[PDB]
């Protein structure tokens, strides 16, 4: 499988999209970015021009005005319009993210200090996922020859250290996945940037998110609520695969 959901060296943009929700976030953010860049450039150019035009060597006697009604009207209404416009594109994107559709696949995820537990209620599968290099895999949260070997053996490389886990949440491509997220001890947060999803894992609460992956491959997230000593060391690996490979993985877990 291709490693898709991951940071890339020197990156300045989002991680690749692998869901329609992520695609929406990329468009909305791109749209807002054009606007706020225009505002910032505008404001910056006004300041630099005013300093040049009205420097004390060039404008020796200062004006004394403290009002300009037309300008004050424009500079109040135009921001309001800009914001209404952002809101209008933004709320539908929000409604799509947060309205949970009917599940093809249901996973229940539990955050622990410091690993994730997954349960597939329809399949009676459960398992835990630890960082490759965590004490669970024999490490102590740092790179070593042993950790590199384990990364290689699991189908990764040295470059995936801190992202790759010993076991992965496996799901089929182009199917609606609903994840139910809770915490076992403290608050954790489960996320996958490529899917455009993030949901706190709060003890005593069961929250839901959804995604539908639009291509196969490997996608990484990292725990996103500070949860103690190994907060930096309990990531998320999702493998998106064919419907057939998904069934094969399920059968591998079936106890006869």
């Amino acid at each position: 499988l291709e490693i898709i959901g991951r940071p890339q060296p020197g990156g300045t943009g989002f991680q690749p999209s692998a869901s329609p929700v992520a695609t929406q976030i990329h468009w909305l953010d791109g749209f807002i970015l054009v606007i706020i860049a225009a505002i910032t450039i505008f404001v910056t150019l006004l300041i630099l021009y005013a300093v040049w035009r009205f420097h004390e060597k060039r404008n020796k006697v200062p004006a004394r005005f403290t009002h300009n009604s037309p300008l004050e009207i424009a500079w109040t209404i135009v921001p309001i319009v800009i914001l209404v416009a952002i809101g209008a594109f933004s709320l539908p994107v929000l409604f799509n993210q947060q309205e949970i559709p009917e599940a093809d696949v249901t996973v229940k995820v539990t955050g622990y200090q410091w690993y994730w537990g997954y349960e597939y209620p329809d399949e009676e599968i459960s398992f835990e996922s630890y960082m490759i290099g965590s004490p669970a895999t024999g490490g102590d949260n740092r790179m070593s020859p042993e950790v590199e070997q384990q990364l290689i053996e699991a189908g990764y490389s040295r470059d995936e250290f801190l992202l790759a886990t010993d076991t992965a949440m496996v799901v089929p491509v182009n199917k609606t996945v609903v994840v139910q997220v809770t915490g076992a001890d403290v608050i954790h947060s489960w996320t996958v940037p490529a899917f455009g999803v993030k949901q706190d894992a709060v003890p005593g609460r069961l929250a839901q998110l959804w995604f539908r992956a639009e291509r196969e491959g490997i996608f990484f997230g990292q725990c996103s609520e500070l949860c103690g000593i190994s907060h930096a060391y309990m990531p998320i690996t999702v493998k998106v695969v064919s419907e057939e490979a998904y069934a094969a993985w399920l059968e591998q877990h079936h106890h006869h």
């Binding site: 991951r6 940071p7 020197g10 990156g11 300045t12 943009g13 976030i25 953010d29 706020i36 505002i39 404001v43 300041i47 005013a50 009205f54 420097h55 004390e56 020796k60 006697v61 200062p62 004006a63 004394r64 005005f65 403290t66 004050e72 109040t76 921001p79 914001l83 952002i86 809101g87 929000l94 409604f95 102590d140 949260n141 740092r142 790179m143 070593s144 470059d159 801190l162 403290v186 608050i187 947060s189 940037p193 455009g196 999803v197 993030k198 706190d200 709060v202 005593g204 609460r205 725990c223 996103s224 609520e225 500070l226 949860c227 103690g228 000593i229 190994s230 907060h231 930096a232 060391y233």
Partner: protein, 535 residues
């Protein structure tokens, strides 16, 4: 002598808050240097468990030199302790004491023509509670804490159940620290409000009060509403930890998310409490150096009032991924967006003030203009974050870290430096050297932009907050951000040199008003420094 610390005069107290805010600022900045040393490269090289085997003093020094990864067992607890220490010091023991306690106490009474403040003795007590709070926060770093080590690694906002389950009593000491800070702030707020209302000079009506004194007045109101709420949230943590309550513990039917509603009800107002006095200082500085009266005085006052008020109804933009319903998320998003309108009015008015002026590019004016640009960069990323659908990606990433450092470290701090250069002659009787102030400005300007701008990229790439270590792909922009932090640190040490030079041998100030006639508030009619008994 210790006639300084027992003084009740608002000028002396103001000066005490400034020096102390500066010293705590130096400590918190030094934490960030160490933080950026560790973030400079992927892999953990500095914060090694091995250094815990040494003594306190010996462990400290070894932890400043890098080790090979193979000799460095990562100590996440120390990372967590350092960033928690950094945030708490900044948010409770640095910028507000400097702006509100410092400039507020020194200058607000001067601006309104008050010879004294309503409660001088309470003012002196407010300072001591600040110092006691700082002492407890620092003590917490050396107290038995999480994971059988010293200190609390729980983040500056103390989320339970993590904060309530952290072992040792480090966290209890931190909570007491914050109680003491709140008490200092509340006393100061009561003092400011009573002074503003009852002790203005004859003729000094509401519509003739300078913008800075207004900024302090509005800020004081925010404090009275916000700080008692915080006192509740953290006392509930204290009783969950020590007195068998289960407010935030699900086994006892509690809800950790309740803590978040209460905490952020304080936590948003907190930032407007930080920034409003900086808005006031910027207004005084720009009018002076543009040689032009402030554009739209009354809208400036009302924009500040509106910002203050709106800052109480937006708190859950800090909780978009914490399990808020779609309806709550939509509301808080729309309410947050509204804040851009009155802030925009203030930004455009500052530019309009400059427009048609006669601009002098002295050091205080450079800080003020840097503020306009940098606060705008920070403000617009705040608007991005207000969008719940996009915050889904950005929440608890370095994009948030970039946002808040632009508004605070390149915003409110630029306001602090603007005030210092603006007013140091007035406070001390000695003037700073102009070339050194400009050099300080440019070093900080370049350094702080190099530190924080690349953090937007890290956040877009999905780098989480509160991580001792990070995937190799984040190396480039982490490296640049760290170099920026080292340059900023150099600029701050240079600044401390500039202050030391100024106070020991700066050019003697001989004029009541050493700027120009457009510095037209009452402090400029007094001597430099003002007499013990003013007006």
């Amino acid at each position: 002598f210790t006639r300084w610390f027992m003084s009740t005069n608002h000028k002396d107290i103001g000066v005490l808050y400034l020096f102390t805010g500066g010293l705590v600022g130096l400590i918190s900045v030094a934490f960030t240097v160490y933080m950026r040393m560790e973030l400079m490269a992927p892999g953990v090289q500095f914060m090694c468990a091995e250094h815990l085997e040494s003594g306190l003093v010996k462990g400290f020094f070894q932890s400043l030199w890098p080790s090979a990864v193979e000799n460095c067992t990562p100590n996440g607890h120390l990372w967590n302790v350092m960033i928690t220490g950094h945030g708490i010091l900044m948010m409770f023991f640095v910028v507000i004491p400097a702006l509100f306690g410092g400039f507020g106490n020194y200058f607000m009474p001067l601006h309104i023509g008050a010879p004294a403040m309503a409660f001088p003795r309470m003012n002196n007590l407010s300072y001591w509670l600040y110092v006691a709070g700082t002492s407890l926060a620092v003590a917490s770093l050396f107290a038995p804490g999480g994971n059988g080590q010293l200190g609390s690694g729980i983040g500056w906002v103390l989320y339970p159940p993590l904060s309530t389950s952290e072992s040792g009593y480090s966290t209890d000491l931190a909570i007491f620290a914050v109680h003491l800070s709140g008490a200092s702030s509340i006393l100061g707020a009561i003092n400011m409000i009573t002074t503003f209302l009852n002790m203005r000079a004859p003729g000094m009506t509401m519509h003739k009060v300078p913008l800075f004194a207004w900024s302090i007045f509005v800020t004081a109101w925010l404090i009275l509403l916000a700080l008692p709420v915080l006192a509740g949230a953290i006392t509930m943590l204290l009783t969950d930890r020590n007195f068998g309550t289960t407010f935030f513990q699900p086994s006892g039917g509690g809800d950790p998310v309740l803590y978040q509603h209460i905490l952020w009800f304080f936590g948003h107002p907190e930032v407007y409490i930080i920034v409003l006095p900086a808005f006031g200082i910027v207004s005084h500085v720009i009018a002076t150096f543009a040689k032009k009266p402030i554009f739209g005085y009354l809208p400036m006052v009302y924009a500040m009032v509106a910002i203050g008020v709106l800052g109480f109804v937006v708190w859950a933009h800090h909780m978009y991924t914490a399990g808020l319903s779609l309806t709550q998320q939509s509301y808080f998003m729309m309410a947050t967006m509204v804040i851009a309108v009155p802030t925009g009015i203030k930004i455009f008015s500052w530019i309009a003030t400059m427009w048609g002026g006669s601009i002098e590019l002295k050091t205080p004016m450079l800080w003020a203009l840097g503020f306009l640009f940098l606060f705008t960069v920070g403000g617009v990323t705040g608007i991005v974050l207000s969008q719940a659908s996009v915050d889904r990606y950005y929440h608890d990433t370095y994009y948030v870290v970039a946002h808040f450092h632009y508004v605070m470290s390149l915003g409110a701090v630029f306001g602090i430096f603007a005030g210092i250069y603006f007013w140091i002659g007035k406070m001390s009787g000695r003037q700073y050297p102009e070339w050194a102030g400009k050099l300080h400005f440019w070093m900080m300007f370049v350094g702080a932009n190099l530190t924080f701008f690349p953090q937007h990229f890290l956040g877009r790439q999905g780098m989480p907050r509160r991580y001792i270590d990070y995937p190799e792909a984040f190396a480039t922009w982490n490296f640049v951000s760290s170099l920026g932090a080292f340059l900023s640190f150099a600029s701050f040490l240079f600044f401390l040199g500039v202050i030391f030079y100024t106070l020991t041998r700066g050019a003697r100030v001989t004029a009541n008003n050493y700027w120009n006639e457009h510095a037209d508030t009452l402090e400029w009619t007094l001597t430099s420094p003002p007499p013990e008994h003013t007006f």
